Design a protein around this ligand. Structure first.
Ligand SMILES: O=S(=O)(O)c1ccc2cc(S(=O)(=O)O)ccc2c1
Ligand SMILES: O=S(=O)(O)c1ccc2cc(S(=O)(=O)O)ccc2c1
Ligand SMILES: O=S(=O)(O)c1ccc2cc(S(=O)(=O)O)ccc2c1
Ligand SMILES: O=S(=O)(O)c1ccc2cc(S(=O)(=O)O)ccc2c1
Lengths: 307, 307, 307, 307
């Protein structure tokens, strides 16, 4: 059908919330692909029954066959080793290479979202091996990182979480650049709320640290982050599929923005029917740019080790 | 039932989209009240059948009896003469008085939203005659006025309409204060988009004029505005009912904000389970404040004629 | 964009709720077309601002130009004289002819939904003059008529309205065939609820009469039916657009079902990406079929007068 | 807040999709309670960030303290040993006893949904130890079991999954009673589709076996069922919270229906603001009743071993 076909390359925990949310939102047919035998068929089966509860009609099928990438409109890549961090780099590069090959053969016109960490590295590797246009591949980062910052501020301020807006750029991971100057509450600069003593500078510094360290905080609580990563990816995928043209911070190919080329980094983009319709370059000051540069340098360091 | 009871005092065009949207959103039971015999029963009947299409369960009933205000959780007032403008003032004051009396008797604990124009005048009159607390009554203005500004900018910029945020304050009507400095696009100050030549200052001045004159533009096109007014009111009502704590610009009692007391004017407020949970005072400069003052003066002029 | 283009040929009251609901549901871009100068531009403007409140991104534009049918994915026809009934027949035939011509020229691949009454007559006339395939054009009837029956029963039984299912076939209008034997409550035959004394046969006979006479009841209450007609049409259009494959009772071309050919009549169909994917023929008994025959005869009588 | 408080007693896989869906649907504040230290705080944190993506405002908090049951409006019990089956019975009885004690002390007015298997046994044990009224506690079964049957049929018939309705009664588990006679497609008896050769009797027998064995099929595919169980529970909880009055098949206290008293079994009930508002007794024939009796006997056998 002219229903979108959404192929989830990797059927782990992120894959399993993504499938669930696609059905809840009736976004398209789903393929849960994985290298593990049968498991994705089992998850797919479980998930398919929710069509009833949700009043939806999305097929959800499992796959242990790469050729099921054929005809995909959207491909979401979570496959990769997670278990030092740097030693995994060349192993995951191999995974990106193999997936990129299959994308180039089976669905060269697919919109691709990469999640595999370190995302700003893996997304470019997949970009290079899949051959897809620069506007048709992006990496998960800023939507997810900002959800934490937005949420933490909204709880202090007692407002709707979505009413806090905020920008985190450069890279996903420990070098993420939190931009205090670009935080708003109901469209109003956060500095007004600081001036008013509704939230203090010291509080915000604790929230910034908490934001950066959230994955680690969840892992030390003996859980792992996958629900919010999944919702963020679906917000991105949905903006493409429904041509919403939402402004969403994602890892995209830089061509001069922030003084950087030939690298992917986190910046606000507009996602619509044509993929990345606009790359928005924040007019950073020199102090913010210095931090952006550190993010890019780290991405470059890890990319060099990936080969 | 512990379903909310929502009483629409006035069952005209705004009333009829409001009832429709309450059912679409399953927000609560609806009473379409009006002084016109039977018409609200007819609209209510029509609307009730949509429960099937929407998978909802909201009763929708008509009423020609004020005592059906009893037990209302939310009351929305659109009743009033619309057909000079100033001569209608004392006539609509009489309507606010009569409604306020019935609210005080039948539902003193209701959250009240006033739409009747000029809203910043009528809302205070109803406040005074209903006896309800200052945090439990508000007027429609800024949500609706900003929807126009946000929408027009979003079309120029090719972004999701909701991703433009903007503030219009002071009053509804021709003295509305559009604050250029408080416009953002995906949380980013609009000035960046001006610096970048994505939108010009002259364009924005045309959009500001268009925003102010939108009711008149719709009326000269031989229609009348009621769909968006209705959606805006429901966004407000929904924030209260579901305790969303959205930041929404509404007419509320001023107690010193902007140098003004003992008057209602448009400002961002937070709407939650406790009504107006926060009144947010924008840190306006002297030039913006001068325009705010003109808005208040006009409200005061018309209020004096209402008595 | 690959957003659907939905053209509403007729921008009256039904047209105005349809546009509103398309935006609420983010279903596609909307054109409000009408022969009345400027009015559809005014309604379209009003409606467009709701994109903000709804978090949607659908263009809503007015049109006084038939060529704006070009590229329509879905066309919904409400245009026609409403103000005896039979004398309007040839006048509305002329309207169907003119619209069909423009559909054939501008959007031969559009899915068409006809509302203009008497719908079972007008839909076939449009079918003949537009040249579209039999699976790509349908008429509004059963979804709307059954909404009333389902709703009235659900109120007596104190259950979710959607949990009552029911079939009304043959034609829209006074000859509609209500099939008692095909009513269920939560999938359970209604006869069990009658056996149990939760609802009586005499009650159901009053509900059947009320269902048939609902348009007239609304009109005698000094309103007119347009909200539910609009929601029903959007349920149909949405099933096509999103390939839901809902079972919905609509006027469709009969090719032997119920002993009838070369005529449109109300029966359950399945609406998906391929239009009418299945025509379902209820296995009526001779008594039910006699009533079906009367419905068809009346449609035929009026069709003969249309030429 | 007058937001509902929903306490999930057990924060495993079912608990984690339930929390996610409550936020997606903005249904109320969530507590993920578990005996495992910190894990529910970690899941709760992850889940809380989705408020941003979903435009919701639900708190999601973890808890290792039973007294956080205080003020719960809805309590959902998934805690229990899963790893023969009968040997776990007295162990899980102990868990129901401990939970029931805390419910009686902290939230005697809560609506309770039990999931712990065997559900028809555990729900009655919790009923007895919590002291709550018979209309305020139910067990998960029929909504979930029928989702499978409805889904499998809808795929054969190429219709919207929700348009298949079906009844499975008696008990959850291997003795579930699938009632062929109560299956409909778009409200039309399934036998018509059999008469028409759209689906065969032998196909349906394979689908019935598949339905019964679905948990086992998922487990043999190296997954486990938790997504659909979660969606089904939320459909139930949502019907209560929003007073939808949906007809949903659940385990409830029998007081003579089907010839059975002093036992819980699966039957259609109506869930609204007053809990179980109606217990609906299907008018089973002697052959269907014999199978119902076997279901009850097995529940009774296991209940006897639980003490
Ligand atoms: O590249 S790493 O493996 O060190 C890495 C970086 C960022 C991450 C973010 C998350 S998040 O989903 O919590 O944003 C989870 C795991 C991560 C791993
Ligand atoms: O007070 S007036 O009658 O002049 C007045 C003011 C503002 C208005 C705004 C609208 S709007 O709904 O277009 O915002 C409609 C009618 C209005 C009438
Ligand atoms: O053909 S008539 O003009 O007599 C006719 C038939 C059925 C109708 C149904 C409705 S309904 O929207 O109430 O179903 C409204 C007007 C109608 C007019
Ligand atoms: O009581 S058992 O442990 O044998 C039992 C019964 C029914 C079940 C149903 C499911 S289901 O979630 O697949 O319906 C899962 C586990 C189950 C365990």
């Amino acid at each position: 059908a002219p229903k979108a076909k959404i192929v989830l390359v990797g059927s782990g925990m992120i894959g399993g919330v993504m499938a669930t949310l696609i059905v809840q939102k009736n976004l398209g047919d789903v393929v849960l692909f994985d290298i593990v035998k049968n498991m994705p068929h089992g998850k797919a089966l479980d998930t398919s029954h929710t069509n009833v509860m949700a009043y939806s009609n999305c097929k959800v099928s499992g796959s242990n066959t790469y050729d099921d990438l054929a005809g995909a409109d959207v491909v979401i890549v979570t496959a990769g080793f997670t278990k030092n961090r740097d030693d995994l780099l060349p192993l995951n590069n191999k995974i990106m290479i193999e997936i990129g090959g299959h994308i180039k053969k089976n669905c060269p016109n697919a919109f691709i979202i990469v999640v595999t960490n370190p995302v700003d590295v893996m997304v470019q590797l997949l970009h290079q091996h899949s051959g897809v246009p620069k506007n048709k591949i992006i990496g998960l980062g800023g939507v997810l990182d900002t959800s934490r910052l937005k949420y933490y501020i909204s709880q202090k301020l007692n407002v709707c979480p979505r009413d806090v807006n905020a920008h985190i750029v450069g890279a996903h991971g420990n070098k993420m650049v939190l931009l205090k100057r670009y935080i708003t509450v109901g469209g109003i600069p956060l500095q007004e709320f600081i001036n008013n003593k509704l939230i203090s500078d010291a509080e915000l510094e604790a929230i910034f640290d908490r934001t950066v360290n959230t994955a680690l905080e969840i892992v030390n609580l003996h859980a792992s982050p996958y629900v919010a990563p999944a919702a963020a990816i679906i917000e991105m995928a949905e903006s493409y599929l429904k041509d919403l043209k939402k402004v969403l911070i994602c890892s995209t190919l830089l061509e001069g923005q922030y003084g950087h080329s030939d690298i992917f980094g986190g910046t606000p983009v507009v996602l619509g029917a044509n993929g990345v319709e606009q790359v928005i370059e924040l007019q950073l000051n020199s102090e913010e740019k210095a931090k952006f540069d550190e993010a890019i340098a780290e991405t470059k360091r890890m990319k060099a080790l990936a080969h």
